[PDB]
Amino acid sequence: MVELTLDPDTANPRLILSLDLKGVRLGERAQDLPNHPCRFDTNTRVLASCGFSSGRHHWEVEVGSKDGWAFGVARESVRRKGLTPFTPEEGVWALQLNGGQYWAVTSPERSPLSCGHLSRVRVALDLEVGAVSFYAVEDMRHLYTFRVNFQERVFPLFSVCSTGTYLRIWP
Amino acid sequence: EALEFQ
């Protein structure tokens, strides 16, 4: 378990980060925010402040019951400026609620999971093995592993592209 | 369009 926080200088301005920087969900308005070259200008994305070069690292994620959220990890080099496809070629290995269904966001086609209703999810990042893995805390059922030859710093990633849903880091 | 912003 890692105590991760959200990097408000990466966040889309349409996002609303919780006081403690653990929560995120879409607002209905852009905000005046000092556009860095590191901020996600168009896609509804925010990384964690802390990224990883080496080792195993766990975070847990409380997810909504309604569509809008994807999350997982992204390589540091993930493009920030412009509309960017949400795919492994673009440096993004994620889980997704969309049409009331859980998907590993693979390409060319997305992979549907036949997992049960999800509430909280453990994210296992193994850089020394070259994999990011997703488990339901509810019994540590394995949801999906992406096998990836990471060749750089890898950051926790969160996207919320509809109102009515959210993601919360635990702990 | 909403999902295009993921």
Numbering used by the authors:
A (entry chain A): 0 to 170
B (entry chain C): 2 to 7
Authors' account:
TRIM7 was also previously identified in a genome-wide overexpression screen as an inhibitor of the picorna-like virus calicivirus murine norovirus (MNV), an activity similarly found to be PRYSPRY-dependent. To test this, we synthesized peptides corresponding to the C-termini of RACO-1, CVB3 2BC, which was previously identified as a possible ligand, and both MNV NS6 and NS3. Remarkably, in ITC experiments with TRIM7 PRYSPRY, all peptides bound with comparable affinity. For the NS6 peptide (NH2-LEALEFQ-COOH, 50 mM in DMSO), the protein was mixed 50:1 and co-crystallized in 1 M Na/K Phosphate pH 5. Data for 2BC and NS6 were collected at the DLS (Didcot, UK) on beamline i24 and i04, respectively, processed using the FASTDP and Xia2dials pipeline and processed as described. Solving the co-crystal structures of each complex revealed that the different peptides are bound in the same PRYSPRY pocket, with the penultimate two residues responsible for most of the binding interaction. In each case, there is the potential for hydrogen bonds between the terminal glutamine residue and TRIM7 residues N383, R385, G408, Q436 and S499. An additional hydrogen bond is also formed between the peptidyl oxygen of the penultimate peptide residue (L or F) and the peptidyl nitrogen of TRIM7 residue T384. In the context of TRIM7 as a restriction factor, this means that CVB3 proteins VP3, 3A and 2C and MNV proteins NS3 and NS6 are possible TRIM7 ligands. For example, human norovirus proteins do not have identical C-termini as MNV1 proteins (e.g., in Norwalk virus, NS6 ends in EGETALE rather than LEALEFQ, but NS3 maintains a terminal LQ).
TRIM7 catalyzes the ubiquitination of multiple substrates with unrelated biological functions. Here we show that TRIM7′s extreme substrate promiscuity is due to a highly unusual binding mechanism, in which the PRYSPRY domain captures any ligand with a C-terminal helix that terminates in a hydrophobic residue followed by a glutamine. Many of the non-structural proteins found in RNA viruses contain C-terminal glutamines as a result of polyprotein cleavage by 3C protease. This viral processing strategy generates novel substrates for TRIM7 and explains its ability to inhibit Coxsackie virus and norovirus replication.
